[PDB]
Structures are given as structure tokens and as C-alpha cells.
Design a protein around this ligand. Structure first.
Ligand SMILES: NC(=[NH2+])NCCC[C@H](N)C(=O)O
Ligand SMILES: NC(=[NH2+])NCCC[C@H](N)C(=O)O
Ligand SMILES: NC(=[NH2+])NCCC[C@H](N)C(=O)O
Lengths: 141, 142
């Protein structure tokens, strides 16, 4: 059973989804979120509604490339699709309108460092509960 | 008159906007297909971006009009993200180097243009961002 890891960062609250068996939370090349991940995402949505802050959603991939592999569909499209896939699950969980400020596709640029040598663990999404400083930053860009 | 570049300093880098005098939207309604005149511009921008060591972020935008089922299904978030990646593929086709892109962003309709309503058609667009080293480290060394 997967769990959320929530800790403080400069930009606010970072939320990571972590599986105990170090199992990838997405099938390779897939932006379909699994039933187990579905439940934990929908469950945290009312909590996010309580927190007056807005959120940023990020999608990630392993560094297994597509055939072209940046000319057409790539890890950029896939990571972005994973971000929005998690977004739709939060909404299904009852996430309020206007809670999302940003969806982000990171491809394989944000590599985890202490979660083992298997690159497949990077197939994931992450959440960021933005503080006022991070939000005002993003908005005035 | 030909469209021009609007460049200003923002917190995580150098933002690049493409401003059209003829007020042509970069995308048709509900479409993530880059309009012809913007394709030419993005391809022209790519080799210049190759000239600097900095990595790039790409953001997509939509007008205020929502989709049929609000935000439960395909929404302006998906559309804006798809528009960001469409501009990405144009840049790559223009000769953008491998590894230049660090981030793609969907902003939906949260960032209307500086003096237009959120309903205006020219909100359907993309914007470019040249990331400073600090933003790049906050992402890579995260
Ligand atoms: N349960 C696990 N530890 N899985 C790791 C292996 C994942 C497999 N190599 C893949 O790409 O799909
Ligand atoms: N089904 C595939 N085409 N897999 C290869 C690409 C996998 C991709 N890098 C991911 O994170 O899922
Ligand atoms: N169901 C619809 N007709 N939706 C139209 C949404 C258009 C979208 N706001 C855009 O910027 O292109």
C-alpha cells in the first residue's frame, strides 16, 4: 500500500507518492494512474481544499526515450499527461475549482537520488502546495 | 507589420513573449496545433536559444472558455499543456539542441495577457522562459 510523504521546502509543502516495494506507480509509457494511486490521490483532495494555498502538479518519466525521440511525442508529452492525470483524480476526489495554479511536465530531469538504482522508480507525479512567495513568483512571471 | 518579441525579467529567468500586431491567435479554439505564422517564428528562435548555455521552460495558455465537463475531464489544463509541447516540437524541428528544454508548463487561463480580458482569443498562446542558474538548480538539485 503506497503512502504520501509530505515535507517542508522553500516553495511550500512538497508531496511525494512512495511505494514500499519500490514499485513504479505508472506502467512504462502510460499516463494511466493505477487503482491504488487513484485512492490515495482522491483521499488527499479534501485536505488540499482546507489549505488556503494553491497547488502545482508535476509529472515525471524515466529516461527511456521514444523512437524519434524529441521530434514528436516524447517524455515531455508523457510527463505532462501524467501531471494532468493526477489532476483529474484530485478533482474526482473533490478538489475545488481554482485550487490548481499550474501543471508541469518535467520528463526525466528531476531524478530521485536515494530510491535505488532502478530508473523505473521515476515514473511518477509530485505535488507542490505553494506558499504565498512561490505563488506570487509564478503569477508575476 | 510583422509580430515582435516582448522580453522582460521575471523571477526564474528571462521571459519571451511573441506579440502579433494583427492579433492572430497562436491556436484555434480547442486546438493545440500551432498556427503557420507562429511555426516560422519558433523555428527562427531555436538556433538563437542554442547559442546560450541556459535551459528553457515552455508555457501554454488558453482563453477563459471551459470544456463541457468543467475540470473533471479534458480541460484548459490539458489543452495549455498540449500547446506548450506543440511549441516544443516546433522548436526542435527548428533545430533546438537536445537537452535544452527543462520544463513544460500548462497555465490554463490563469495568466491572461497584460491588457486583454481572459476571454480574448489571443490568450490562446505559448510563452518562452530562459531559466537563470538559480531556477535551474532549484529544479535539477531539488
Ligand atoms: N516492482 C519493482 N521493483 N519494479 C521494478 C522494475 C520495473 C520494470 N523494469 C519496468 O520498467 O516496468
Ligand atoms: N511504453 C513505452 N514506450 N515505454 C518507453 C518510454 C517510457 C517512459 N520514459 C516512461 O517514463 O514511462
Ligand atoms: N467545449 C469547448 N468548445 N471548449 C472550448 C475551449 C477553448 C479553450 N478555452 C481554448 O483556449 O482554446
Amino acid at each position: 500500500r503506497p503512502h504520501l510523504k509530505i515535507d517542508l521546502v522553500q516553495e511550500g509543502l512538497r508531496i511525494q507518492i512512495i511505494d514500499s516495494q519500490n514499485r513504479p506507480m505508472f506502467k512504462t509509457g502510460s499516463a494511466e494512474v493505477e487503482p491504488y494511486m487513484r485512492d490515495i490521490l482522491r483521499a488527499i483532495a479534501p485536505v488540499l481544499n482546507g489549505i488556503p494555498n494553491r497547488i502545482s502538479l508535476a509529472g515525471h518519466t524515466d529516461d527511456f526515450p521514444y523512437a524519434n525521440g524529441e521530434k514528436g511525442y516524447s517524455n515531455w508529452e508523457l510527463s505532462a499527461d501524467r501531471a494532468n492525470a493526477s489532476r483529474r483524480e484530485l478533482v474526482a476526489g473533490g478538489l475545488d475549482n481554482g485550487k490548481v495554479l499550474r501543471v508541469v511536465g518535467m520528463a526525466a530531469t528531476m531524478r530521485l537520488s536515494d530510491r535505488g538504482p532502478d530508473d523505473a522508480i521515476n515514473r511518477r507525479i509530485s505535488l507542490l502546495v505553494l506558499n504565498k512567495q512561490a505563488e506570487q513568483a509564478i503569477l508575476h512571471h
